[model samples]
Target chain A: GSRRASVGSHRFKVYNYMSPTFCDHCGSLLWGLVKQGLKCEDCGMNVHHKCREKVANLCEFIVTD
Target chain B: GSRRASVGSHRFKVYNYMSPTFCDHCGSLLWGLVKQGLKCEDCGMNVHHKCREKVANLCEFIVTD
Candidate 1:
């Protein structure tokens, strides 16, 4: 079965990278005019839309206060 | 005026670190029996309860598909 996109725990969002960014999972360049890839809202891990389910769920969060 | 906690952007949460951790801002050890520090839900920035407001609002997020 195709893996479901895990949106839980790691709050990822669509991002338009200004620089030449690569996918953290597949090591391929994120190609797009806009909304090139997804950025995790918590951990800052970038990945391709097709590779999201392959990424591990370990999210390193930041401390604020 | 006292600095207000910037909870609007960072999404800091109480975190009980098992290993010895230090505050990102003050560079001091985090001391506590529980909830030793606040972890950013978005950026994974560790900070003290008293120093949260002093941190800048630059949150580097992760990417997912």
Candidate 2:
């Protein structure tokens, strides 16, 4: 999903790693490896996949017994 | 007049050359020489003339030509 790449993961969780992602900000197709974060070339808005509130929070810690 | 600013010409096509210019993205005053290509300091977006393109694709074009 579009949310997957914004969080800083190598691959999408729900679906296996995919290629050709879009900018989370401007929706322009991304053709390069996302750096520390993705910044829209058109709008320059940047966001990490995990930073996407609508998607899974990989940063969330799980407590175990 | 605004369209003149969008194009590559240093002088506005319709109007005379202006001292200050605004970033295409954030509308911020561009205080510097654009470094061959104008990159918005606020948003990191950029644009430049075809000549500038020859030297550097201006972060906008990272793809192989």
Candidate 3:
């Protein structure tokens, strides 16, 4: 299924926040007046676009669907 | 005075968002769960860390003190 393509990183989505949250990478406060950064859909990793590229690729995704 | 030496750029500080805000550079919603990005102390310019380097050197700061 070529599911393994680009599987070396976390699959992230633009997270929407209704409460306080922090960047898992920088451990800093995420901006709260606009978009809420990104959240890994599989491993639940969260970080800013600034912190995204530096994050480790350790996605815990166990599904192929 | 040396005040005119580094006077070509915006002086930024880590912005704290107590409410909604947006990046003055890319016009994107700043991440709202962790750090609230950066704000220019002089011109009130705001931007994300990722968007910082691309911004123009337009600091409106007039005073040297």
Candidate 4:
């Protein structure tokens, strides 16, 4: 069973890690700073809905697993 | 107006699901899976040619959409 891993409007799966409280990118601890937004405490990776769009602009490649 | 969703080639559009009758990766249910690839009947995930290689490895830290 897979789960939702959202960087923004773009949502996908994060392989083996499943948990709404986990960071989609690094599988770190999420702070849930805002609605549907997360801050990774382990890697300091900040991900917002708007920020995801920005990241997408820089991430043309897609990872499939 | 809407078609073709691949990962390796950099394509994205999942607002809806179309039917092509096959799995692009595992090659399941492929009547003629020679051209484009398809996903599972339930998941409906498809990737580009380059994506085939991307998934086999984990070195996609510099992707820009």
lDDT of 3 at A47: 91
Higher-ranked by TM-score: 1 or 3: 1
Native-to-model Cα distance after best TM-score fit, residue B7 in candidate 4, in Å: 7.5
Expressed as tens digits, the lDDT of each residue in A1-65 for candidate 1 is 12112223555689989999999999999997689999987568999998888888665443433
Output DockQ, candidate 1.
Answer: 0.03
- Candidates in order have lDDT scores of 0.73, 0.33, 0.70, 0.37
| Docking class of predicted structure 1 | incorrect
Cα lDDT of model 4 by residue, B1-65, tens digit: 12223222223232222445544555555344354543332234555444454444211122233
Return the lDDT, model 1, position B55.
Answer: 89
Which ranges of candidate 4 are over 4 A from the true structure? A1-20, A25-29, A38-47, A57-65, B1-65
Model 2 over residues B1-65: C-alpha lDDT tens digits? Answer: 01110111122111222456554544445455434344433224433432223332222212111
Task: Pick the winner on TM-score between candidates 2 and 3.
Answer: 3
Q: How close is candidate 3 to the true structure, as a TM-score?
A: 0.39
* CAPRI-style quality class for the chain A–B interface of candidate 4: incorrect
Q: Say what the RMSD of model 2 is.
A: 18.2
Residue A12, model 2: Cα distance from true site in angstroms: 15
Score residue A19 of candidate 3 by CA lDDT: 76
Instruction: Between candidates 1 and 2, name the one with more favorable TM-score.
Output: 1
What fraction of the reference interface contacts is present in each model, in order? 0.00, 0.00, 0.00, 0.00
Q: Which candidate has the top score in lDDT? A: 1
